[PDB]
């Protein structure tokens, strides 16, 4: 037991494997690919190193019916310790994108192969999101506030793709595209800055909609969200304080340095111009010489 | 009409054109732009002794334009010019305007009335009569920040306390002296103190310098590859 899952690093091996595995069972139409994920666990950083399918069925008539083969999980463990003992079961991927309550009960099962709470790694294989190709959640059991019972629930814990070093080599090989976002030159980051504003703006739009549905359509108040929003209003920049004024002075400080640099280049660019005109000057003379030199050549043929 | 060509001309031609624009713009009371063309007219023009009329008359005209602004051309401009003999009237006017004396300005123009009439700089000088007063109170603004009305009248020999207020109002409308009068309280209080890196005005100054640098970055590029084309196309030894 430990509640340690604060950062989830994903190897790119896991996201492409989940892409294959969905298609090697051929699940569709809110049928799911449930397999295991292995890695290291019982630790502050989880590294999700590997993924495998398991036998699994998903019934659409009742979501409390699914199949799972237990004997498969025991036999796969024996094998993987021989390849690598740094690999152990750390929880399960689920194809998603929809998280359900019956998935808490699948969760309980996986809590009998790993000491830590199992990690349920939602990998969207349908590629509907333009960001989040990983969202990670861990089941924890806690008394929920506002007269509410003890609920078993899936809380979001930070995840990011970071890649192993051994993985990296192949990531470099398969990416031969120009990369619209890669953090390049002036050009690459002006495309980014625009992209970044529409990113945030849409994220902000979900918050508006959510809030409306709480008091219109009576969504359950989840006071965690609402607490975070109090701090949103409390970290708002307020104008007319000496801080904002110093920031406008700093925009001139920075543009000041940009101006000196721009002049310095104007001398390089003019240096290049000067140097071509010298070449062209010479070339006028060389072309003139050919005309004289012909006469000298013609005269020899006649003589000899 | 605005179709003057820069396409397949000489620089002398450009120098000629700019000189005419300066005269028109200066008398239509837009000295800022008249000055900016006359500096360019001199630059674009070749500098030689067969170019001496142009050089002499464009240096004369430029200085008349600075006095019209309220600026003083450099003393050093006149002394280190090797045309210092004919810039004898102009050394005198630049001095008369600086010192602010009304008496000196009248006296100087009376001699060199003819001299100024030749070069078409007499027209400028009629309005430099106005400009004497303005310079003299620019000195007063820089020395003294609070100065009673009477004290100004004693220095500058002005007739009444009411009169000098009218003159200062005209000037502070145009925003040169940048002062503000207190009529009731019987003083004039200079309001200039600058401190403008605290305003957003340096962003606008920076817009021009980047814009200026940009102008050369296009110009080199287009011209440079142009001679090279012919030379490869043509035979070589």
Which DSSP string corresponds to A202-241? HHHHHHHHHHHHHHHS-PPP-HHHHHHHHHHTTS---SSS
Rounded distance between C-alpha atoms, residue A128 and residue A124, angstroms: 8
CA B35 and chain centroid, separation: 5
- Asked if the Cβ–Cβ distance from A252 to B197 is below 8 Å, we say yes
Query: What residues of B are in contact with residue A283 (Cβ under 8 Å)?
Result: 231, 236
Query: What residues of B are in contact with residue A262 (Cβ under 8 Å)?
Result: 209-210, 213
**H, E, C per residue of A32-60:** CCEEEEEEECCCCEEEEEEEEECCEEECC
Solved with: cryo-EM
Q: Is B205 on the interface with A (CB under 8 A)?
A: no
- Resolution in A for the shown PDB structure? 5.4
Identify whether the C-beta of residue B92 lies closer than 8 Å to the C-beta of residue B112.
yes
Residues in chain B: 237
Identify whether the C-beta of residue A56 lies closer than 8 Å to the C-beta of residue A103.
no
The residue among B9, B2, B19, B101 whose CA lies nearest residue B58 is B19
- Asked if the Cβ–Cβ distance from B228 to A259 is below 8 Å, we say no
Residue of B216, B227, B237 lying closest to A286 (CB–CB): B237
Rounded distance between C-alpha atoms, residue A140 and residue A152, angstroms: 6
Residue of A249, A287, A289 lying closest to B231 (CB–CB): A287
Residue A297 host element (H or E): helix A242-303
From residue B29, alpha-carbon distances to A6, A161, A304, B184 in Å are: 73, 68, 80, 34
Q: Is A193 on the interface with B (CB under 8 A)?
A: no
DSSP B196: T
Opening angle at CA B141, ends B137 and B147, nearest 5: 100
Helix ranges (H only) for B28-160 are 31-44, 52-69, 75-80, 88-99, 102-111, 113-119, 122-126, 128-143, 149-156
Q: Is B218 on the interface with A (CB under 8 A)?
A: no
Identify whether the C-beta of residue B89 lies closer than 8 Å to the C-beta of residue B108.
yes
- Asked if the Cβ–Cβ distance from A284 to B224 is below 8 Å, we say no
Rounded distance between C-alpha atoms, residue A161 and residue A164, angstroms: 9
Residue of B nearest to A249 (CA): B198
Cα distance from N-terminal residue to C-terminal residue, chain A: 106
Q: Is B194 on the interface with A (CB under 8 A)?
A: no
Residue of B200, B217, B235 lying closest to A266 (CB–CB): B217
Cα of B192 to nearest chain A Cα, Å: 21
Q: Is A252 on the interface with B (CB under 8 A)?
A: yes
Residue of A nearest to B236 (CA): A287
Cα of B8 to nearest chain A Cα, Å: 18
Angle at which helices B128-143 and B149-156 cross, to 10°: 130
Q: Is B186 on the interface with A (CB under 8 A)?
A: no
Q: Which of B207, B216, B218 to probe the A interface (max A CBs under 10 A)?
A: B216
Query: What residues of B are in contact with residue A285 (Cβ under 8 Å)?
Result: none
- Asked if the Cβ–Cβ distance from A276 to B210 is below 8 Å, we say no
Query: What residues of A are in contact with residue B195 (Cβ under 8 Å)?
Result: none
Query: What residues of B are in contact with residue A270 (Cβ under 8 Å)?
Result: 216, 220
Residue B220 host element (H or E): helix B201-233
Identify whether the C-beta of residue A10 lies closer than 8 Å to the C-beta of residue A162.
yes
- Asked if the Cβ–Cβ distance from A255 to B206 is below 8 Å, we say yes
- Residue A133's contacts (CB-CB under 8 Å, 6 or more residues apart) are A15, A123, A124, A127, A161
Q: Is B204 on the interface with A (CB under 8 A)?
A: no
DSSP A2: -
Identify whether the C-beta of residue A41 lies closer than 8 Å to the C-beta of residue A116.
yes
Identify whether the C-beta of residue A200 lies closer than 8 Å to the C-beta of residue A207.
no
Cα of B212 to nearest chain A Cα, Å: 9
A·B CB contacts under 8 A: 64
- Asked if the Cβ–Cβ distance from B228 to A273 is below 8 Å, we say no
Cα of A30 to nearest chain B Cα, Å: 57
Per DSSP bridges, beta strands A150-156 and B146-147 are unpaired
- Residue B138 tokens, joined: 């620019």
Residue of A nearest to B227 (CA): A280
Residue of A263, A280, A286 lying closest to B227 (CB–CB): A280
Phi, psi of A240 (to 5 degrees): 80, 10
Q: Is A29 on the interface with B (CB under 8 A)?
A: no
């Amino acid at each position: 037991m430990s509640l340690q899952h604060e950062k989830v690093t994903i190897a790119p091996l896991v996201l492409l494997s989940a892409l294959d595995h969905y298609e090697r069972t051929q699940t569709k139409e809110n049928k799911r690919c449930v397999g295991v994920i292995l890695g290291d666990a019982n630790s502050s950083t989880i590294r999700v190193t590997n993924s495998f399918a398991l036998p699994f069925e998903e019934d659409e008539k009742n979501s409390d019916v699914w199949f799972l083969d237990h004997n498969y999980i025991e036999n796969m463990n024996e094998m993987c310790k021989k390849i690598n003992a740094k690999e152990k079961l750390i929880g399960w991927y689920h194809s998603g994108p929809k998280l359900r309550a019956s998935d808490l009960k699948i969760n309980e099962l996986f809590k009998k192969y790993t000491q830590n709470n199992p990690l349920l790694l939602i990998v969207d294989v349908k590629q509907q999101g333009v960001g989040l190709p990983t969202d990670a959640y861990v089941a924890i059991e806690q008394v929920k506030d506002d007269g509410t019972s003890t609920e078993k629930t899936f809380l979001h814990l930070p995840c990011t793709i970071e890649a192993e070093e051994a993985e990296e080599i192949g990531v470099e090989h398969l990416l031969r595209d120009v990369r619209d976002q890669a953090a390049g030159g002036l050009s690459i980051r002006l495309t980014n800055q625009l992209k970044s504003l529409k990113g945030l703006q849409s994220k902000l739009k979900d918050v508006v909609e959510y809030l409306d549905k709480v008091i219109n359509k009576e969504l359950p108040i989840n006071h965690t969200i609402l607490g975070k929003l109090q701090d949103v209003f409390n970290l708002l920049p307020n104008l007319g304080t000496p801080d904002d004024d110093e920031i406008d002075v700093e925009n001139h400080d920075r543009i000041n340095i940009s101006n000196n640099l721009q002049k310095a280049l104007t001398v390089k660019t003019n240096d290049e111009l000067m140097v071509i005109y010298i070449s062209n000057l010479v070339r006028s003379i060389i072309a003139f010489d050919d005309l004289i030199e012909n006469k000298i050549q013609n005269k020899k043929i006649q003589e000899q | 009409k605005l179709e003057y060509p820069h396409t397949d001309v000489s620089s002398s031609l450009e120098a000629r054109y700019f000189f005419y624009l300066s005269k028109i713009n200066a008398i239509q009371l837009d000295y800022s732009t008249a000055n900016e063309y006359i500096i360019a007219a001199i630059r674009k023009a070749p500098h030689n002794s067969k170019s001496l009329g142009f050089l002499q008359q464009s240096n004369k005209l430029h200085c008349c334009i600075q006095l019209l602004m309220g600026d003083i051309p450099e003393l050093s401009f006149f002394h280190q010019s090797n045309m210092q003999k004919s810039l004898l009237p102009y050394y005198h006017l630049t001095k008369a305007v600086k010192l602010g004396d009304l008496k000196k300005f009248t006296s100087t123009i009376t001699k060199y009335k003819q001299l100024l009439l030749k070069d078409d700089t007499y027209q400028l000088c009629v309005r430099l009569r106005s400009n004497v007063i303005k310079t003299g109170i620019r000195i007063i603004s820089l020395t003294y920040k609070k100065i009673s009305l009477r004290d100004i009248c004693l220095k500058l020999n002005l007739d009444s306390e009411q009169t000098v207020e009218y003159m200062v109002s005209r000037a502070i409308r145009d925003g040169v002296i940048e002062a503000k009068i207190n009529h009731e309280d019987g003083f004039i209080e200079t309001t200039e103190l600058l401190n403008i890196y605290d305003s957003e005005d340096p962003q606008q100054v920076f817009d021009e310098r980047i814009k200026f640098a940009n102008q050369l970055h296009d110009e080199y590029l287009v011209s440079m590859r142009y001679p090279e084309d012919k030379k490869t196309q043509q035979n070589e030894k």
